Scaffold this active site. Sequence first.
Site, PDB file in Angstrom:
ATOM      1  N   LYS B  17       0.831  -1.179   0.137  1.00 48.63           N
ATOM      2  CA  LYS B  17      -0.159  -0.407  -0.077  1.00 48.63           C
ATOM      3  C   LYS B  17       1.046   1.254   0.194  1.00 48.63           C
ATOM      4  O   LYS B  17       0.473   2.604  -1.432  1.00 48.63           O
ATOM      5  CB  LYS B  17      -0.963  -0.430   1.111  1.00 48.63           C
ATOM      6  N   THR B  18       1.745   1.065   0.841  1.00 49.94           N
ATOM      7  CA  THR B  18       2.620   2.210   1.359  1.00 49.94           C
ATOM      8  C   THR B  18       3.930   2.709  -0.326  1.00 49.94           C
ATOM      9  O   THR B  18       4.051   3.823  -0.328  1.00 49.94           O
ATOM     10  CB  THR B  18       3.484   2.714   2.407  1.00 49.94           C
ATOM     11  N   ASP B 500     -60.633  15.544  18.435  1.00 44.50           N
ATOM     12  CA  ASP B 500     -60.685  16.995  18.398  1.00 44.50           C
ATOM     13  C   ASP B 500     -59.801  17.535  18.139  1.00 44.50           C
ATOM     14  O   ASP B 500     -60.458  18.863  18.468  1.00 44.50           O
ATOM     15  CB  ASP B 500     -61.739  17.424  19.656  1.00 44.50           C
ATOM     16  N   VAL B 506     -55.404  10.660  17.748  1.00 48.16           N
ATOM     17  CA  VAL B 506     -56.194   9.558  18.678  1.00 48.16           C
ATOM     18  C   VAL B 506     -57.111   9.907  18.507  1.00 48.16           C
ATOM     19  O   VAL B 506     -57.642  10.493  18.124  1.00 48.16           O
ATOM     20  CB  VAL B 506     -55.496  10.144  19.861  1.00 48.16           C
ATOM     21  N   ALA B 517     -59.124   7.439  25.193  1.00 51.36           N
ATOM     22  CA  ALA B 517     -58.737   8.011  24.153  1.00 51.36           C
ATOM     23  C   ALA B 517     -57.140   7.088  23.545  1.00 51.36           C
ATOM     24  O   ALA B 517     -56.623   6.895  24.781  1.00 51.36           O
ATOM     25  CB  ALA B 517     -57.658   9.175  24.414  1.00 51.36           C
ATOM     26  N   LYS B 519     -54.961   6.331  20.739  1.00 51.60           N
ATOM     27  CA  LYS B 519     -54.060   7.017  19.107  1.00 51.60           C
ATOM     28  C   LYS B 519     -53.622   5.740  18.340  1.00 51.60           C
ATOM     29  O   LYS B 519     -53.020   4.709  18.606  1.00 51.60           O
ATOM     30  CB  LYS B 519     -52.937   7.771  20.077  1.00 51.60           C
ATOM     31  N   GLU B 561     -55.595   6.921  29.226  1.00 50.72           N
ATOM     32  CA  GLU B 561     -56.278   7.753  30.128  1.00 50.72           C
ATOM     33  C   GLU B 561     -57.301   9.033  29.463  1.00 50.72           C
ATOM     34  O   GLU B 561     -55.935   9.581  29.138  1.00 50.72           O
ATOM     35  CB  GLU B 561     -56.573   7.844  31.610  1.00 50.72           C
ATOM     36  N   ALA B 563     -58.566  12.942  29.114  1.00 50.25           N
ATOM     37  CA  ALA B 563     -58.750  14.017  29.719  1.00 50.25           C
ATOM     38  C   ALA B 563     -59.544  14.421  29.315  1.00 50.25           C
ATOM     39  O   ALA B 563     -60.051  15.197  27.877  1.00 50.25           O
ATOM     40  CB  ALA B 563     -57.360  14.707  29.269  1.00 50.25           C
ATOM     41  N   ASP B 607     -39.661  20.483  25.433  1.00 56.38           N
ATOM     42  CA  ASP B 607     -40.830  21.117  24.801  1.00 56.38           C
ATOM     43  C   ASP B 607     -41.790  21.426  25.731  1.00 56.38           C
ATOM     44  O   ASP B 607     -42.441  19.852  25.655  1.00 56.38           O
ATOM     45  CB  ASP B 607     -41.422  20.380  23.462  1.00 56.38           C
TER      46      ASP B 607
HETATM   47  N1  LIG Z   1       9.271  -6.888  -5.251  1.00 57.29           N
HETATM   48  C1  LIG Z   1       7.684  -6.512  -5.520  1.00 57.29           C
HETATM   49  N2  LIG Z   1       7.906  -6.130  -3.734  1.00 57.29           N
HETATM   50  C2  LIG Z   1       6.467  -5.532  -3.081  1.00 57.29           C
HETATM   51  C3  LIG Z   1       5.853  -5.571  -4.198  1.00 57.29           C
HETATM   52  N3  LIG Z   1       4.821  -4.548  -4.207  1.00 57.29           N
HETATM   53  C4  LIG Z   1       5.319  -4.394  -2.350  1.00 57.29           C
HETATM   54  N4  LIG Z   1       6.290  -4.860  -2.520  1.00 57.29           N
HETATM   55  C5  LIG Z   1       6.515  -5.043  -0.880  1.00 57.29           C
HETATM   56  O1  LIG Z   1       5.953  -4.787  -0.601  1.00 57.29           O
HETATM   57  C6  LIG Z   1       7.140  -4.320   0.633  1.00 57.29           C
HETATM   58  C7  LIG Z   1       5.231  -3.180   0.979  1.00 57.29           C
HETATM   59  O2  LIG Z   1       4.338  -3.344   2.345  1.00 57.29           O
HETATM   60  P1  LIG Z   1       3.113  -2.525   3.245  1.00 57.29           P
HETATM   61  O3  LIG Z   1       3.155  -1.875   2.155  1.00 57.29           O
HETATM   62  O4  LIG Z   1       4.949  -1.004   2.996  1.00 57.29           O
HETATM   63  O5  LIG Z   1       3.327  -3.246   4.041  1.00 57.29           O
HETATM   64  P2  LIG Z   1       1.936  -2.175   4.973  1.00 57.29           P
HETATM   65  O6  LIG Z   1       2.217  -1.077   5.360  1.00 57.29           O
HETATM   66  O7  LIG Z   1       0.763  -3.078   6.078  1.00 57.29           O
HETATM   67  O8  LIG Z   1       0.424  -1.774   4.065  1.00 57.29           O
HETATM   68  C8  LIG Z   1       7.798  -3.850   0.521  1.00 57.29           C
HETATM   69  O9  LIG Z   1       9.135  -4.308   1.310  1.00 57.29           O
HETATM   70  C9  LIG Z   1       7.772  -4.055  -0.956  1.00 57.29           C
HETATM   71  O10 LIG Z   1       8.928  -4.549  -0.619  1.00 57.29           O
HETATM   72  C10 LIG Z   1       6.322  -5.214  -6.085  1.00 57.29           C
HETATM   73  O11 LIG Z   1       5.070  -5.495  -7.103  1.00 57.29           O
HETATM   74  N5  LIG Z   1       6.761  -6.245  -6.241  1.00 57.29           N
END
Ligand SMILES: Nc1nc2c(ncn2[C@@H]2O[C@H](COP(=O)(O)OP(=O)(O)O)[C@@H](O)[C@H]2O)c(=O)[nH]1
Lengths: 221, 608
Positions: B17-18, B500, B506, B517, B519, B561, B563, B607
Amino acid sequence: FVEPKWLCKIMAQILTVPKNYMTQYFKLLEKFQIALVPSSLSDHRPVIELPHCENSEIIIRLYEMPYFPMGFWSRLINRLLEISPYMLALRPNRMYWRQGIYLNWSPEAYCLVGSEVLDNHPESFLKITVPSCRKGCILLGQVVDHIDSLMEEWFPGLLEIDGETLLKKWALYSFNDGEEHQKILLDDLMKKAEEGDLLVNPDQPRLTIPISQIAPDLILA
Amino acid sequence: PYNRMKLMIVGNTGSGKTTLLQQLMKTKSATVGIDVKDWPIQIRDKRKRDLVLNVWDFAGREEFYSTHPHFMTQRALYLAVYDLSKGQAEVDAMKPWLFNIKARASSSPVILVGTHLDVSKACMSKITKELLNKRGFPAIRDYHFVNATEESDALAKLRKTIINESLNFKIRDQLVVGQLIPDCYVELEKIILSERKNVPIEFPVIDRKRLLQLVRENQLQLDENELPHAVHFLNESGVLLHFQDPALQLSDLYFVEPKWLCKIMAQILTVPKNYMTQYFKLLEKFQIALVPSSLSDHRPVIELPHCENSEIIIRLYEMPYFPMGFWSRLINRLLEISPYMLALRPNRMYWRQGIYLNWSPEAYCLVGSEVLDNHPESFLKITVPSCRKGCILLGQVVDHIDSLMEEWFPGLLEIDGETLLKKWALYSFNDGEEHQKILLDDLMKKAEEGDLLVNPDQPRLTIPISQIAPDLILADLPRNIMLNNDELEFEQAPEFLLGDGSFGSVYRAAYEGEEVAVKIFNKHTSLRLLRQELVVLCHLHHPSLISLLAAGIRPRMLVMELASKGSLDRLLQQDKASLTRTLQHRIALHVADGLRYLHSAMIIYRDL
Ligand SMILES: Nc1nc2c(ncn2[C@@H]2O[C@H](COP(=O)(O)OP(=O)(O)O)[C@@H](O)[C@H]2O)c(=O)[nH]1
């Protein structure tokens, strides 16, 4: 049973996993403490928020020993299996683990046995919690008698006086009015020798606690 | 025009992801928190709409799953990365994430991304195109087999697809990316962005007084009464976070730079002395406090007091998976807020997927996940004794669960209709001795309210619907409130025998030999609100307060009841001469007595 190695091997078979004697098979399976398998019970205390805090509304008793004997908790759980009722009927709620039972009738008629580990103490403990009411007192009497009987029947060497005795039964009392904490622990034999009176008193004798609300198995309560 | 939208990067642990994000923004270590950022996309087309996505790199590790559903909103696009390397099973391993995107943001796109194309198994598109397309899933709109750690034509096509699929969002033809906003909002956003730099790094939080000083120090014409709307809108866009709820003591602090808050909060799940108490309060608000996660995950053996199928009441709750923070919020919600009586604290034995409150051997309640054979789905079996106190507990628990679902996971109730959440009710025609409880969908039993019994193919057997589902028939309340339809002389709607004053529907009728009454609640609405009313009015019982004589299911009505002289408003408007000084004082005294009783029970009449 001739050739006993066959019996023992066959009995230990199920701990790793003759259609006539199936019922006898199960009976002696319980006699070996295999039956609900008392071993492999997840070993992890589940969180339990008891109804009653306050040191003046519960009765604690410990049981100190260097280690728990091998099949100690299995035989104890089996012995405490509904054989300790508050009344003389109703089946109570039960939450077993590998080192406890926790029978529970009502918010004032419960009983929790279970290992409790303390800081700066390599020894092992068997803290018992119980409410201070009448029904609580009944449960505490039965449990202590059951435990003491088991020790005298199976593990005699844990009671042989030499004399630290390797098994020191404590009783947790709190002169601190119940509000404050750090329950002072008093050896049971010393309190037994304090049967001459019917109260316990500290260095400042303005405070007092009746020995009933500490150890209601000694005084006939 | 507000050119800003949230990009959420969902995925599983270890899956890239990162690194995919570092290669998407061209910006040449396990995630902790959600790691907020933001990258500006300068689109070079004729429509040079410079948009700014703010990414939310969700952490894959399980221990953080309790806090994620707080940061999943509708106005956002999702990614979902799933590590092609372990093919044909990593796709079936991310169905929980997709199901959760479906529950929280039911109408948001999802762009499947397959990383690790260098190593190996690209025929995972088969299962993606067969099982993952439309069968209870959040409307997938593209799927790519991309590499990371290097830019190529794959990442280029993926980046262009994210851009395009963002601009053409159109929730009910709205075009989120180009809507209009008051200019003061974007001005407020710019001054916050500048304040991001001039603030201590150890504590980036800002004070409401500091904000007031800042908005006054510049020419921002935002009035004091306008600030809540503005600050809440910037919250929705993920600029700054804030919690205007007065239950917390945080409404004076406006969290700028939210990535710091999220990282700090997730710090304790892997292991400023003034704000310690506020720290703990918002720790509970994130469901971290007793840590509901890491609770040993293992059901402890429980030998209930009552066997016998005719002495317990079961209800299931079927769903494909449990939502992310489902069990945490439920445990927190059920924390002693469901008492049998209206006091006593009950015994509680928590684990990761259950609570088990227990008063007495006939007044217990066990919620907890239960898995069945030959069923990959998940269940939420609830066990409860058949007595009166049991019925009260079952009503409260079902209402609490239903409320949580409607509040947090709306996508689990949206009708298309399997509905993804089928509430069962286990009944046993088998006399209680025998077993294998026949399971009947709740809506079908609701449609079986015409009678007051259930009957099998052999109608010699019967079971009252009270001892099956006492939340439908009004039995969960204390003090049996049945109507006894024989006594009633109600007239449906003659434009006559009407209350009424047309306050509600009601009418007027005779019951138990006296005028009353009635409702008529019967309408397109369900029986939730009826149960809510009935509970509040069933235990107040003060002479000043109006008292309820009865209630009835067929048709849905409640008998109050009567009124005699009607509302005070009509009396003062048309019969002013009737009010003597003593009468005015008596009316004031009775109303004051009612307020005193209501405030004794900690209720605000609002209210009046
Ligand atoms: N060789 C290779 N490694 C990948 C690829 N995609 C992700 N990685 C590996 O995934 C790791 C990153 O994990 P990360 O996304 O940070 O884990 P998360 O933070 O839990 O989502 C890195 O060490 C990369 O080496 C890819 O397409 N090729």
